[PDB]
What does this fold into?
Amino acid sequence: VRFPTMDEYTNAREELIGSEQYLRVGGSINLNNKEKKLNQFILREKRAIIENSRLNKTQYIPAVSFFLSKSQMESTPIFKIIKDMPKGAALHLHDTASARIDWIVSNATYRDHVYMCMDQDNFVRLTVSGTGPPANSGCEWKLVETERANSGDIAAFDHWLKSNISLLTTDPLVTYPSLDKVWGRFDKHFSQLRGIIYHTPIRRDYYRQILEEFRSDNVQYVEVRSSLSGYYDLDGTVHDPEYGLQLYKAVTEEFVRTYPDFSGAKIIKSTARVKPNTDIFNDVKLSMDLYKRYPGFFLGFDLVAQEDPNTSLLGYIDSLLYPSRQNPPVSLPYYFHAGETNWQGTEVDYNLVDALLLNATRIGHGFALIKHPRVIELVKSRGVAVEVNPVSNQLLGLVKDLRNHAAAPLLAQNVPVVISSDDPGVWEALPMSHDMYVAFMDLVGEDAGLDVLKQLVWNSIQYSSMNATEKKTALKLLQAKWNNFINDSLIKWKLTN
Amino acid sequence: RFPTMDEYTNAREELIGSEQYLRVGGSINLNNKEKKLNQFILREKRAIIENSRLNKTQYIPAVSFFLSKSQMESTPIFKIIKDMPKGAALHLHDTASARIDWIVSNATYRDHVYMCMDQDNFVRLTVSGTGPPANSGCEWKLVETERANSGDIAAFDHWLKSNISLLTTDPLVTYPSLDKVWGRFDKHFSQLRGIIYHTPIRRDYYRQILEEFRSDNVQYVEVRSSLSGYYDLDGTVHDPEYGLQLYKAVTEEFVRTYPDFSGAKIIKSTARVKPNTDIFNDVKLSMDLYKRYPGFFLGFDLVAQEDPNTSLLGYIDSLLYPSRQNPPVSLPYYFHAGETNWQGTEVDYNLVDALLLNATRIGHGFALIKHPRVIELVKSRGVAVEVNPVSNQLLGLVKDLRNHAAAPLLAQNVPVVISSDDPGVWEALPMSHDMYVAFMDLVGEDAGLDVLKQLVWNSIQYSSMNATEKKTALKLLQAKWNNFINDSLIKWKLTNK
Ligand SMILES: *[C@@H]1O[C@H](CO)[C@@H](O[C@@H]2O[C@H](CO)[C@@H](O)[C@H](O)[C@H]2NC(C)=O)[C@H](O)[C@H]1NC(C)=O
Ligand SMILES: *[C@@H]1O[C@H](CO)[C@@H](O[C@@H]2O[C@H](CO)[C@@H](O)[C@H](O)[C@H]2NC(C)=O)[C@H](O)[C@H]1NC(C)=O
Ligand SMILES: *[C@@H]1O[C@H](CO)[C@@H](O)[C@H](O)[C@H]1NC(C)=O
Ligand SMILES: *[C@@H]1O[C@H](CO)[C@@H](O)[C@H](O)[C@H]1NC(C)=O
Ligand SMILES: *[C@@H]1O[C@H](CO)[C@@H](O)[C@H](O)[C@H]1NC(C)=O
Ligand SMILES: *[C@@H]1O[C@H](CO)[C@@H](O)[C@H](O)[C@H]1NC(C)=O
Ligand SMILES: *[C@@H]1O[C@H](CO)[C@@H](O)[C@H](O)[C@H]1NC(C)=O
Ligand SMILES: *[C@@H]1O[C@H](CO)[C@@H](O)[C@H](O)[C@H]1NC(C)=O
Ligand SMILES: [Zn+2]
Ligand SMILES: [Zn+2]
It folds into this structure.
């Protein structure tokens, strides 16, 4: 008889469950006594919300649309703890989508020579024109200063601007109920802001706001995708990508000199995968040059824009292999978005295969990765972190209930993962706290606590592209922040026994 | 590493080929005729996926069954799967596996059938030979009278069907939460309970399961049944052994009539809402029926909604009782387990207990991909997972079926059988709808006839037939398969004339 007594059965059961706990993200962390006090509180709070949803037969709010869950999570202790927690790094961000729309309205649209129009889809667009009103080809441009002053209600005018640009004005899962409809709205958002956010002094100040906002959410480091190109002055001068990089380098250096508690930022050049192979070839050659001349600030290259309907990595493969085929070879790092899809066995999810054959340093999303066991082996073996952006994947159509997020089985296998926010400004998310809350409540289990959070935070620095010296310094800083956070939390939640 | 495209191509195809060999069916070698059909299926699959992907429209095989049912039935892939022999349906509930149309057109035309509108405004049906039933919470009326006075009998009969089926409206819209749709599902069983437990109707309903499954080219079924409480017009209530004998006699007559049908076996099910003291008696009952009906009675299962009700651990002394006897008794178990979106809770840890108790097959295992050690145990022991994709969508575990959690199981060749669960409740065919959605949503664009063939063979190889029965059934399946291949080449004009 295998299990003659309850003790024989529970021994076997607990060993099996415990063995799985040891294998998931964070499973090897040993919390100290102060961390354990906070962990026990976090776990009591987590069990209360889950058991209420399960036994009282009501929806699990952390997993529903961000439109519905945002205001509900923000009043809760677990969210308030994650808000205070140091996050380490946000490694997957886009530079035109990472600061508040409120700042675009309250700051940028109060500058001279900003114009607005309603396009033929009934969306507001914003741009800058130094010479005069822009040509009235597809819409009638009007000076924002005049429209605001004539609105008869300035606060309502500004709120309307914000409402007409944000993807969280209504629930995207209701208003744009298909992949194509919501990506239509997402694409439109960037068209709405493109003119104003490419004007050089606004773009400079917007990048500074990214750093300020991320610091204010207790993020100490960011790596940012940027096209770098086409920043334009009031007189019409258009700058090249190297200028865009130098501009970001100077903002970043000023910021880190102001805030020693902040580790800094580095940049990845992104190009939209709707362009011909000759454009990607030129941007690859550009990236080779910037990688050589800005070591330690310019990281490498990525291809962006919607993955499903546009060009695969294989479609650009001669361009992407060009660095490695030089004599001597040139090693241009790649940070490919890859597998941001529900498709299986197609040109889209097979981008994961090409991303690994091209030696990607990290991969963006990897939503399809759990369908590719041989790619998982390579990702684990090589230490290629997967940048998981859970709110983005829900709102942009890959999943509805976030407990079905395809990164939950990755985390259960200890695939290297970092959490990030992707385009938080587009849908009114915080730099990291909302995405970290939904990862913690939806993508790991009821009995997963502070150890998961600590591991994800440490991962974001460990799998950053900092050099060894920078990384050692950043981890010492993170450890200090973490200690202060534990001590402060014990006092705040009245856990000091 | 890749000086030319040929070297890059070779590495890419080696990695993709490794994944294709690993997944379900990857080791099958198709013959020349099967390859011709395979090439047509793959051409059809690529055309529909590429149209969805490149023309930016929804992928109909993955949307709500309410919307996709009428669309898939006109397509060649569906028609091929319809004609295909399925082998076995191994996961079925006996009060939910024949057509509601038969309940209406046959059962509700029988003498002594009554109907009433309950307090939730649903029709309920029952039989009473000894006068009309007492007006306890509803007012019973003879159906024969209600029908004859309707003024439109076609509309009356259609109203009955529409008031009972869960596919009258889209459940994802009408009942848009787990608790709401399970409320509707539970209500469906309440609507039919009275009529479907009347002995001659139950007998004839079970015969209709066999007729309908045979007509969808299924040759064998294993069926969960509560067995107990069938009642006669004079009020006699029968015991579970009688219910088992009733099904045994129907099955034997069916196989005499149709030697091209392999037959059926029965699993006793009990609802997991009962006190542990009552489950103990159902385990003892199952031990006795297993001893005395070897080869027809298979074992035991616990059913009803998994999330809010009792876990396997809550019944553990009852479930361990057979193994603890002197001498031990090996009562086989077929546990529904992990039919849930929860992680790290009592519900998904039912999978651990299912394995410790040596389950022969596991029902659903939706949460299994979150449990890497349980997966390895399932693979090494050959415990088949019964995957019921339409059920999991309509009853609230997933919306886009390409997010179904069995797709990563099939990619690692976890042993899986496809089944339909409760097809009569939502107007599905015995197997062809579930096999179509598994084929179109749970494996990739490059997965063809080898996946179908493997899942069909799996349904016999992981059945509970003894070894001699399996060999007989596989010879019968092979002949059906060969006829299906030849017929398909002629029907789809593939013979290369
Ligand atoms: C962007 O703003 C426009 C202009 O206000 C909105 O269009 C209006 O939408 C309302 C609904 O509240 C319609 O009844 C009106 O007819 C529209 N007015 C005009 C002048 O066209 C539009 O809905 C906003 N779009 C978004 C996504 O918020
Ligand atoms: C089952 O049948 C009842 C009775 O016909 C339906 O009741 C009707 O419900 C609609 C609302 O959807 C009302 O407008 C009607 O007045 C109701 N009629 C009566 C006589 O009450 C009920 O909707 C049906 N339920 C389902 C799920 O189909
Ligand atoms: C269910 O809700 C009630 C209040 O409506 C509360 O008393 C009870 O604790 C809840 N159960 C759980 C497990 O949260
Ligand atoms: C906008 O930000 C710039 C740069 O920080 C600042 O100088 C200016 O005062 C701001 N405008 C408003 C209206 O606050
Ligand atoms: C990828 O990395 C390996 C090991 O460092 C190297 O030998 C190979 O050339 C690289 N391949 C490419 C395509 O850069
Ligand atoms: C997209 O639709 C057009 C017009 O119906 C059709 O010609 C084209 O072949 C479709 N594309 C694909 C890839 O199916
Ligand atoms: C119902 O089925 C029974 C038993 O198979 C059959 O004898 C009877 O004719 C059927 N009733 C109708 C209305 O078809
Ligand atoms: C499970 O099976 C093993 C191997 O057949 C056997 O030794 C063991 O006693 C069984 N356990 C239970 C709980 O029935
Ligand atoms: Zn991104
Ligand atoms: Zn079932």
